[PDB]
Design a protein around this motif. Structure first.
Motif, PDB file in Angstrom:
ATOM      1  N   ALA B  70     -26.974  16.249  35.063  1.00 13.79           N
ATOM      2  CA  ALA B  70     -26.594  16.319  36.391  1.00 13.79           C
ATOM      3  C   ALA B  70     -26.047  15.019  37.126  1.00 13.79           C
ATOM      4  N   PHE B  71     -26.787  13.993  36.346  1.00  9.90           N
ATOM      5  CA  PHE B  71     -26.205  12.567  37.084  1.00  9.90           C
ATOM      6  C   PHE B  71     -24.834  12.238  36.528  1.00  9.90           C
ATOM      7  N   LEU B  72     -24.784  12.450  35.199  1.00 10.47           N
ATOM      8  CA  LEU B  72     -23.430  11.916  34.345  1.00 10.47           C
ATOM      9  C   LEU B  72     -22.253  12.688  34.720  1.00 10.47           C
ATOM     10  N   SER B  73     -22.314  13.931  34.992  1.00  7.42           N
ATOM     11  CA  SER B  73     -21.316  14.723  35.521  1.00  7.42           C
ATOM     12  C   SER B  73     -21.411  14.859  37.030  1.00  7.42           C
ATOM     13  N   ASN B  74     -22.160  14.531  37.710  1.00  3.82           N
ATOM     14  CA  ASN B  74     -22.334  14.494  39.235  1.00  3.82           C
ATOM     15  C   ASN B  74     -22.102  16.123  39.612  1.00  3.82           C
ATOM     16  N   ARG B  75     -22.989  17.008  39.099  1.00  2.78           N
ATOM     17  CA  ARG B  75     -23.127  18.248  39.326  1.00  2.78           C
ATOM     18  C   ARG B  75     -24.466  18.552  38.996  1.00  2.78           C
ATOM     19  N   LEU B  76     -24.870  19.571  39.931  1.00  2.00           N
ATOM     20  CA  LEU B  76     -26.250  20.170  39.954  1.00  2.00           C
ATOM     21  C   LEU B  76     -26.488  20.914  38.606  1.00  2.00           C
ATOM     22  N   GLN B  77     -27.811  21.096  38.265  1.00  2.41           N
ATOM     23  CA  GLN B  77     -28.140  21.619  37.150  1.00  2.41           C
ATOM     24  C   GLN B  77     -29.422  22.377  37.602  1.00  2.41           C
ATOM     25  N   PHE B  78     -29.715  23.694  37.186  1.00  2.00           N
ATOM     26  CA  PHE B  78     -30.597  24.554  37.681  1.00  2.00           C
ATOM     27  C   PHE B  78     -31.261  25.517  36.665  1.00  2.00           C
TER      28      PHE B  78
END
Lengths: 151, 151
Positions: B70-78
Motif C-alpha cells: 500500500a505504501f510503496l505503490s501508494n494505493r489502498l489494499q484491503f
C-alpha cells in the motif's frame, strides 16, 4: 521533523510508563500535563478511564486548585481519602466519579522549576499514598522530566 | 519546543480521530504509522485493542506485505474476508487474533508521495470495505495527511 520524531518518541515513552504504572498499582487513572508556550498545563498523556470527566481538562495553574498548588509551589499534593477533603463541591464531584484517593506530583529536573504535573487517581482504595509509594511516583516523575528535556 | 507543542497537538488530533472512527463504525482496531527519518513506518497512534499483537509493530516497507504494498505503490489494499486470503500463515495468524476484515490506506497529500499508512481492522464483520466506506477512510487519511504536514 527530527524534533517532531523525537516528540513522537517522547509520547510513547510517557504513555508506556503510565500504562505500566496502572498495571502494577491500584491506580485507575493517571494524567501527565505539560506547560505549553502560554503557560497552560495541557494534557499530553493519560492511561485508564475518566479523561472525558473531572480529572481530564487543561489547567491554567492557580493556588485555588490542588494541581495549581502543586505546580506553583513545586511540591506534591495528595488526598488519601476523598471523604475528608475540605472543598465541599469538588469533593462531591470527585466522589460522584468514584475517586477515593489522589495525588499531584510536580515534573521537574532536580533544582529546576517544574514544567508539568503527574496526577494519579484511585477509584479502588484509600491510603494509597504512603511515603514508599510517593517515593516511587517522584522517581517516575523525574524520569519523565528527563525524557521531556531530552526533547 | 514550539514544534514540540505542535507535534503534541498533532498526536491528540490523530488519537481523537481514530477514537471517533471506532465509535462510529464496526472497526475494532485502527493504527496510524508515519515514516521516520530512516524510512521505517513507525506506530504513532492507535485506538482499540490488539496493538500488543499481530497488527501492532513498526514496518520497513516491503512489497511482500499488504501494508508495504500500500505504501510503496501508494494505493489502498484491503481484504473483505480473511478466510479467503492467499497468504496461508499470515491468514492463520490473523484469524487466531479474530480478524475478519482489514484495510491499509496511504496517508498522503493529493499528488504527493505517502508519508504513512492508516490501517484498520474489524474483529466484528466481513465486507466492511465497500466503496462508500473506502471513500470515508480516504477522506480521513487526507485530513491526517494535512495535519502532519502542518507540523
Amino acid at each position: 521533523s527530527e524534533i517532531m520524531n523525537r516528540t513522537l518518541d517522547l509520547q510513547i515513552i510517557m504513555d508506556d510508563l503510565l500504562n505500566l504504572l496502572l498495571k502494577e498499582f491500584k491506580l485507575d487513572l493517571a494524567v501527565i500535563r505539560l506547560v505549553d508556550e502560554k503557560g497552560v498545563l495541557r494534557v499530553r498523556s493519560y492511561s485508564g478511564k475518566g479523561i472525558a470527566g473531572i480529572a481530564g481538562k487543561d489547567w491554567e495553574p492557580e493556588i485555588e486548585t490542588y494541581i495549581g498548588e502543586a505546580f506553583l509551589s513545586n511540591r506534591l499534593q495528595f488526598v488519601n481519602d476523598t471523604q475528608y477533603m475540605t472543598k465541599p463541591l469538588t469533593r462531591e464531584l470527585m466522589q460522584k466519579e468514584g475517586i477515593k484517593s489522589f495525588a499531584h506530583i510536580p515534573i521537574s529536573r532536580k533544582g529546576e522549576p517544574p514544567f508539568g504535573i503527574l496526577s494519579v487517581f484511585s477509584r479502588t482504595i484509600v491510603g494509597l499514598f504512603n511515603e514508599p509509594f510517593l517515593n516511587l511516583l517522584e522517581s517516575l516523575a523525574g524520569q519523565l522530566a528527563q525524557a521531556v528535556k531530552i526533547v
